[model samples]
Target: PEFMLLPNILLTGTPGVGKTTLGKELASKSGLKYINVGDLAREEQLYDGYDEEYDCPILDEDRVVDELDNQMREGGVIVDYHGCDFFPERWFHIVFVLRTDTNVLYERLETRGYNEKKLTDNIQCEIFQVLYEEATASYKEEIVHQLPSNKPEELENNVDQILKWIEQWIKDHNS
Candidate 1:
């Protein structure tokens, strides 16, 4: 009764990285459930209020977990968000901390129309490996993956790698 057909994936990274693109593509290609936590928080009103300083919503982690806990435990979910520390330990079997070159990241944020303050903060966040550090500290080192999303081919490779892992998991858990 407890065998999950597919693994739950935590896809996390800083703003302006291709996490949304990857989450959508990976879900479509793998037939797994995709939840963009940022969108969910906004649409469902799952936050305390807006983060004025960051020009973003301040996610209410407790409420978010209440809404998503069951589905996450059921597995086969791709929880896509920028932050990682708040999610519970059992929710994700593997976590991907996506990264990109600062030069590339700068242009991407610029194209996204980020203001000066947010842009600089995010670029610094990536450079400092903020998300990576949070993810590694929040989850097991073995399950945390540091992947790049600087190029189209790199995204494809990441999907392929996870797909292979999916097949292997299915084989190992076929009960």
Candidate 2:
């Protein structure tokens, strides 16, 4: 009940799924703090070193969680990332796995200047529903939602759907 004022949100999907935009919007509207862990890891120097295969820095999960140690307990966090399996189950109250059409996704990733392997890997991840599967596998099925992200309208609908859940979460657990 002490943390009822805000619920933690996990927004994850393959690259180009609009998770960043949607997560920020949801956090902004709900007055929750947003953390793009990929960005955070780089900005905070929480990574171990560079990864040639992924074309990015390799994050140290322990350091990442250490940095977020206290705030997660106080709640009101919206975590946006392309993957979900690294975080502890306790950090998330509700998990959203955003999905987009593969064709749309391919073009989106291409536009973002993603490297060849990175682009192929992400598109395949989406096709295989890897992130969504990870979300459900890592958390309670009832709390995991596989939401569409093909359009702005879909993003708005997901936001509205989650806002209602936020209200319910606070109501049910209010101190």
Candidate 3:
């Protein structure tokens, strides 16, 4: 059950960019534990207060980091979150920044019933490539990948590519 050779991966992107979906798929394929950071924060009460404006919790970064520290140490976790700033750079071996066309993202957010302000904020985040910028700043460019998620087929392809990378990583570790 232990996968020491598999690297800890952080799947990050703007809201509605399909980070969760891709994380789940990757974890299932790679035999890693899939964790949605937001859900963990909520379940563990690792937040100070709820943000009524965004209908989400205001996370306590320190608390979240403490909670995830053990998992990171163990490795083999596919962590999914919109932001990657709080995580220690050393915790991740690969960071996947999912990107979607702004128009497609807007439609996806709309389907989720995001309020105007939240919707606009996320749209701007995607347009600005905030997740990609954050990952590049926090981790080496060699380990960070910007993958497209504009359609189902693209997501499938991304998962396939990641699985191949995981196999190579395991092989290299063994060698």
Kindly give the stretch of ten consecutive residues in candidate 1 with the minimal lDDT sum. 1-10
Model 2 lDDT vs. the true structure?
0.88
Question: Where in model 3 is the C-alpha error above 4 Å?
Answer: 50-55
Worst 10 residues of 2 by lDDT: 1-10
Query: Model 1 off-target regions past 4 Å?
Result: 1-4
The residue pairs in collision within model 2 are none
Q: Of 2 and 3, which scores higher on TM-score?
A: 3
Q: Give me the overall lDDT of model 3.
A: 0.89
* Candidate no. 2 TM-score: 0.93
Candidate 2 regions exceeding 4 Å error are 1-4
Residue-wise C-alpha lDDT for candidate 3, range 42-82, written one tens digit per residue: 79988898789677769899998999899788878899999
lDDT of 1 by residue, 106-147 (tens): 999999998899899999999999999999999999999988
Q: Which ranking of candidates, highest lDDT first?
A: 3, 1, 2
At residue 92, candidate 3 shows an lDDT of 91
TM-score of each: 0.94, 0.93, 0.94
